[PDB]
Amino acid sequence: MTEIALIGNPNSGKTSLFNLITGHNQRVGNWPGVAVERKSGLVKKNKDLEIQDLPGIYSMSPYSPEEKVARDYLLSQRADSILNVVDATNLERNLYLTTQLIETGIPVTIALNMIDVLDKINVDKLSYHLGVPVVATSALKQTGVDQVVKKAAHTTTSTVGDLAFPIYDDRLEAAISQILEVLGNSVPQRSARFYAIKLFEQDSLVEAELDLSQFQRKEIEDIIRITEEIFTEDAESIVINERYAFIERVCQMAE
Numbered sequence: 225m226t227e228i229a230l231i232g233n234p235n236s237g238k239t240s241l242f243n244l245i246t247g248h249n250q251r252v253g254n255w256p257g258v259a260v261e262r263k264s265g266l267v268k269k270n271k272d273l274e275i276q277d278l279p280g281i282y283s284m285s286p287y288s289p290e291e292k293v294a295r296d297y298l299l300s301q302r303a304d305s306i307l308n309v310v311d312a313t314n315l316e317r318n319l320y321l322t323t324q325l326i327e328t329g330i331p332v333t334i335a336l337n338m339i340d341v342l343d344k345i346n347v348d349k350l351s352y353h354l355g356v357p358v359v360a361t362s363a364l365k366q367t368g369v370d371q372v373v374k375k376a377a378h379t380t381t382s383t384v385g386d387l388a389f390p391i392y393d394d395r396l397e398a399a400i401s402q403i404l405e406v407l408g409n410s411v412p413q414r415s416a417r418f419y420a421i422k423l424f425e426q427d428s429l430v431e432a433e434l435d436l437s438q439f440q441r442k443e444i445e446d447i448i449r450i451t452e453e454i455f456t457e458d459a460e461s462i463v464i465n466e467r468y469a470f471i472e473r474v475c476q477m478a479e
């Protein structure tokens with residue numbers, strides 16, 4: 225009845241959390257026509273909640289079969305929640321994916337894992353500035369697991385209304401606004417920002433997927449051409465640097 229997608233960087237403790245949450249209620253198979261493990265399970269302590277594991281990834285690029293599975297599933301609306309496993313010992317770099325996950329429009333909850341090793345992070349202030357709930361967990365000591373599962377189960381597409389996205393530089397936002405206004409009804413409302421950023425990056429999968437008119441296509445090219453002159457960097461590099469700047473600010477404001 226509530227579908228939670230478990231994802232995060234490799235070696236963030238995702239398997240460990242997944243096994244604790246689901247116990248031996250796990251199903252193993254594969255993603256259709258792709259050589260990638262598919263696993264899921266019911267939450268041991270609440271069988272109305274189901275965890276869909278997703279391959280560990282650093283980013284949602286179009287080049288990797290794992291990343292495409294991650295993306296295709298999150299943009300398919302099967303998930304009510306994303307429970308983002310984050311390595312607290314390497315916070316900033318893990319948040320690179322976190323920003324992308326928020327952009328899908330499926331509400332994110334962060335299991336701030338490996339908190340035991342970390343023994344400075346202000347959980348309440350980190351949650352405030354990222355705009356997602358954050359629960360310190362330890363898969364080793366088995367702390368915060370039930371708490372984060374409970375937060376995620378109550379942080380869904382039907383409970384969350386004001387979806388707070390990472391706001392970037394005015395000059396990138398202008399280009400995203402212009403792309404959203406161009407796209408209009410040609411993409412889903414929930415994940416509109418995800419698609420706009422991807423079109424701005426000239427993402428092969430997204431271009432091939434959307435039936436965009438010549439009118440739409442030409443406006444998006446203009447927007448991209450101009451924004452590259454305003455920033456003096458290529459579209460991809462603009463988005464990469466803006467993601468890290470947003471991560472660098474948020475971490476400054478909360479340690």
Ligand SMILES: Nc1nc2c(ncn2[C@@H]2O[C@H](COP(=O)(O)OP(N)(=O)O)[C@@H](O)[C@H]2O)c(=O)[nH]1
Binds near residue numbers: 234235280362363365
């Ligand atoms: N100290 C500590 N180790 C953890 C924690 N979570 C996972 N690990 C350890 O990290 C290593 C990799 O764990 P794993 O679940 O496979 O990470 P992944 N690859 O994201 O599934 C294992 O040795 C596991 O015991 C944690 O919260 N604290």
